[PDB]
Amino acid sequence: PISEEEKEGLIEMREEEKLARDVYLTLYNKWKLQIFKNIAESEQTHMDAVKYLLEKYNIPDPVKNDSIGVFSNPKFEELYKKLVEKGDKSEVDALKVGATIEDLDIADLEKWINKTDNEDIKFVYENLMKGSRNHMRAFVRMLNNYGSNYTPQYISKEEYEEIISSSTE
Amino acid sequence: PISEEEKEGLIEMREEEKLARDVYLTLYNKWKLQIFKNIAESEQTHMDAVKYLLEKYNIPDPVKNDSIGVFSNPKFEELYKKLVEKGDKSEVDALKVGATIEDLDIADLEKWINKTDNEDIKFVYENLMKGSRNHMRAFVRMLNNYGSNYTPQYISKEEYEEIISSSTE
Ligand SMILES: [Mn+2]
Ligand SMILES: [Mn+2]
Ligand SMILES: [Mn+2]
Ligand SMILES: [Mn+2]
């Protein structure tokens, strides 16, 4: 059976995937870099994956309004606003924000992964995490094309180096 | 030729139609009342009409990001946020917000209409205004079905009474 702590996790990650989807849709509409469109689609997939677990356990969905920018947990509302403002400044700032979101997601997925023994919850979280590593590699390579790079904020320097020095999974 | 004042008008109204489109899309996603979907479509039409004038005179479009909730003029950013927060409380509050937006739009269209002699600008503004009267009648009738009604905020009491006591145009 699912624990209250495990429920709290799925609730947070349901909106964390939405944060990434929403920022990326917003930055695509701004800068029309295909990367944002492509990855926003992948985030929609991830949102769906978490929703399927929510439904499986009949947990109330925090997403009561699918509209871009709308969140139940204000942690994500504040992150949405701060990150779109940053990302509006330049193509490089928007790509840095992509890398930032993925950085936070990988750190948060690690957090929740380490609090559960449920194999169906782990498979989804591991798959989400593999996705976020792929996204991080894609955003950084793009920052490289602009003559830029990324400094990690949430995961360790060492984890960041392992991600970017390997090819996409 | 177009005046700087006339340009300022089209710039404001381009984002004012977006405000209505965006709040209505957001409230539809919340409450799934068809009225919001239907009228949001009409606002997309109105947005397009203003854009066609912007392009005709090669005025820079204030809409640099079509994403819901994004505005160049912060008057509309603040209105977007305040109105979605209000509209999230209940179906009746959301319908009151529809009526409010239309109220403001009719008042603002009257303002700009009275500052121009350009027939192509007037035709569009008159057509927009006829649209907003239709929308206001639809939102109020819906509030009536909920046992509610609307108090005008921007247009006069007398103008509000003329609108709602006539049938849709
Ligand atoms: Mn994801
Ligand atoms: Mn991602
Ligand atoms: Mn309109
Ligand atoms: Mn309207």
From Swiss-Prot, chains A, B:
It comes from the Archaea. CDD domains: Ferritin_like_AB2. This is Uncharacterized protein MJ0754. It comes from Methanocaldococcus jannaschii (strain ATCC 43067 / DSM 2661 / JAL-1 / JCM 10045 / NBRC 100440). The lineage of its organism: Archaea, Methanobacteriati, Methanobacteriota, Methanomada group, Methanococci.
